[PDB]
Amino acid sequence: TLPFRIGHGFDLHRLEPGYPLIIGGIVIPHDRGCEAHSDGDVLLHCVVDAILGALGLPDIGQIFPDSDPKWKGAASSVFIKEAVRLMDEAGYEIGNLDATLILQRPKISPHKETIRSNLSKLLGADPSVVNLKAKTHEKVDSLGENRSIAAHTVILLMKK
Amino acid sequence: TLPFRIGHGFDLHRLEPGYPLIIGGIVIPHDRGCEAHSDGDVLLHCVVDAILGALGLPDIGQIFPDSDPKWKGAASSVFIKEAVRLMDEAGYEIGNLDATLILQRPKISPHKETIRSNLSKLLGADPSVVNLKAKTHEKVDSLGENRSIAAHTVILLMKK
Amino acid sequence: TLPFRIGHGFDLHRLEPGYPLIIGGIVIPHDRGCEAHSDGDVLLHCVVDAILGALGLPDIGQIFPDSDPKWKGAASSVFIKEAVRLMDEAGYEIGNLDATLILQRPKISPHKETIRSNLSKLLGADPSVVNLKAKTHEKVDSLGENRSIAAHTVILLMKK
Ligand SMILES: Nc1ccn([C@@H]2O[C@H](COP(=O)(O)O)[C@@H](O)[C@H]2O)c(=O)n1
Ligand SMILES: Nc1ccn([C@@H]2O[C@H](COP(=O)(O)O)[C@@H](O)[C@H]2O)c(=O)n1
Ligand SMILES: Nc1ccn([C@@H]2O[C@H](COP(=O)(O)O)[C@@H](O)[C@H]2O)c(=O)n1
Ligand SMILES: [Cl-]
Ligand SMILES: [Cl-]
Ligand SMILES: [Cl-]
Ligand SMILES: [Zn+2]
Ligand SMILES: [Zn+2]
Ligand SMILES: [Zn+2]
Structure with a gap:
């Protein structure tokens, strides 16, 4: 069994x-937001996919499909907790x-520590090992036109 | 010499x-496919670039250029085998x-284990350490309009 | 404290x-270039964000904001040196x-070793552990239309 495992997640929403x-997990006010079947939480979904993928x-979509055992309108917290259980x-x-959020507007930096603490709380990890940064998309393509939001996550998992 | 080496690959095709x-390596039927000089295998090309880049x-493009030693119409398997030889x-x-495929349509999940086994066979690795996931692009930009397909790969290499 | 830390950076410019x-750090002649408040160095900025994020x-933007202590017209070298100091x-x-540059035109490969040596010099690392590759974007979206340039970096940091 491997001492370290690398994961990558990507997600995008309209x-x-x-x-x-x-x-x-954090509400940010804005003239636009995510139109999705989920709660639209691009950061939470791509952290989940990074964990699942590292493992x-x-x-x-395979673990939490559109069709009940118990999902459909689950808060993305539900998917984070199931992923950390399977990891464990x-x-x-x-x-x-290390997560990268791509978002033209609004500014994420004022909410950053609030986001990091909530994501850390849900992962059961120390905030000193959970990081998030944000980037605009320079007014080009859907992301730049604020017609979407994307997230990348790279994760390094350790054998207990 | 370093016990671990990290790699990232990206590829996109029309x-x-x-x-x-x-x-x-796997044929998937669909109303559209890759218009390329390669066989268009976005996943195979970006795994190759992740390996090459980790090392x-x-x-x-530098190792397998447009101009024969022996390439031009090589199946992407040829590039995977040369990359694992150079790694070795x-x-x-x-x-x-951990590879992420971005593709609006069709659905990749039914073919997933078939893809993973073929990619594992070509890498000479166990399927339990080779992963692939897929994501739509929410109907936005070329990827969302099914006018392209992209792949990211993150890889962690180990010293023998 | 963790023996290894993983980082990801992304940057895009018009x-x-x-x-x-x-x-x-290297000048490349071309009919277009970066319109930015920075020197526009997408590779240098995203290496910096990968280091900062790994740590x-x-x-x-938080460390080097628009508002002087001493920035505003700093060459991107200034940000690389501050990041390696904080890492140290x-x-x-x-x-x-491992950095991936996405750029339709011009061709980066002839300048590649020049870029790698300069980036290595600024990081204080050996060129044998600092890598860069390039990719077109197949004539689609802003990147394909040569209306922008993007860079991804994945980095693996080691405890001294
Ligand atoms: N081309 C694609 C795109 C997505 N999928 C699957 O559909 C799920 C949902 O993807 P989206 O959130 O992008 O809709 C993914 O998590 C994956 O299981 C797929 O199997 N083939
Ligand atoms: N701006 C660019 C884009 C690609 N390239 C080179 O061209 C090769 C082919 O890139 P594409 O498949 O995107 O055409 C790359 O693998 C790289 O060697 C480059 O040198 N400069
Ligand atoms: N949605 C966003 C986008 C960027 N930012 C911040 O603005 C800085 C500059 O981002 P750009 O270079 O994309 O303009 C980032 O490094 C980050 O500190 C943010 O706080 N919220
Ligand atoms: Cl804006
Ligand atoms: Cl669709
Ligand atoms: Cl071109
Ligand atoms: Zn999502
Ligand atoms: Zn390709
Ligand atoms: Zn920049």
Whole structure:
């Protein structure tokens, strides 16, 4: 069994007027937000896919499909907790996590420590090993036109 | 010499009507496929670039250029096998691999284990350390309009 | 404290006619270049964000904001040197770095070793652990239309 396992997640959602903008569990006010079947939490979904992928498990759509055992309107916290449980039972913990959010507007930096603490609380990890940064998309393509929001996560898992 | 080496690959191809859609060696039927000089295998090309990049070698275009030693119409398997040979001679093996495919349509999940087994066979690695997930692009930009397909790979290499 | 720390950076800039194209400190002639408040160095900025992110520090905009202590027209070298200082004081060094540049035109490969040596010089790392590759964007979206340039970096940091 491997002492370290590397994961990558990506997620993108459409932003449309009058919808919720929820990032890592945190509500951020804005003229646009995520139009999705989920709660639209691009950061939470791609952290989940990074964990699942580091471990070689089925992906977020395979584990939590559109069709009930118990999902459909689950808060993204539900998917984060199930992913850390499966990680734990596989014999791994979080070494560190680095997420990049791509978002034209609004500014994420004022909410950053609030996001990091909530994401850390849900992962059961120390905030000193869970990181998030943000970037605009320079007014080009859908992301730049604020017609979408994307997140990348790279994660390094450690054998317990 | 370093016990671990990290790599990242990215590739994107145009999708046009009536072309082959080949992903990780596997044929997937679809109204569009890759218009390319390669066989268009976005997953295979970006795994190759992740390996090459983890090792600090020239990239896929530098190692396998348009101009014969022996390439031009090589199946992407040829590039995967040459990359694992160069990795081996550098003194490394695969720790784990996590690839993300971005594709609006069709659905990749039914073909997933078939893709993973073929990619594992070509890498000479166990399927339990080679992972692939897929994501739509929410109907935005070329990827969302099914006018292209992209792949990211993060890889962690281990010293033998 | 963790023996290894993983980082990811992303950056994108607009390309417009008659501007400088500077990549990893190196001038590359071209009919378009980066229109930015920075020197526009997408590779240098995203290496900085990968380092900062691996360490869990504030991001490039938070550490080097628009408002003087001493920035505003700093060459991107200034940000690279401050990032390696903060890495050093945190007790880390570079294990390896793999950057991917996405650029339709011009061709980066002829300048590649020049870029790698300059980036290595600024990081205080050996060129054998600092890697860069390049990719087109297949004539689609802003990147494909040469209306922008993007860079991804994955980095693995080692405890001293
Ligand atoms: N081309 C694709 C795109 C997505 N998928 C699957 O659909 C799920 C949902 O993807 P989206 O959130 O992008 O809709 C993914 O997590 C994956 O299981 C797929 O199987 N083939
Ligand atoms: N701006 C760019 C884009 C690509 N390239 C080189 O061209 C090769 C082929 O890139 P594409 O498959 O994107 O055409 C790359 O693997 C790289 O060697 C480059 O040298 N400069
Ligand atoms: N949505 C966003 C986008 C960027 N930012 C911040 O602004 C800085 C500059 O981002 P750009 O270079 O993309 O303009 C980032 O490094 C980050 O500190 C943010 O706080 N919220
Ligand atoms: Cl804006
Ligand atoms: Cl669709
Ligand atoms: Cl071109
Ligand atoms: Zn999502
Ligand atoms: Zn390709
Ligand atoms: Zn920048």
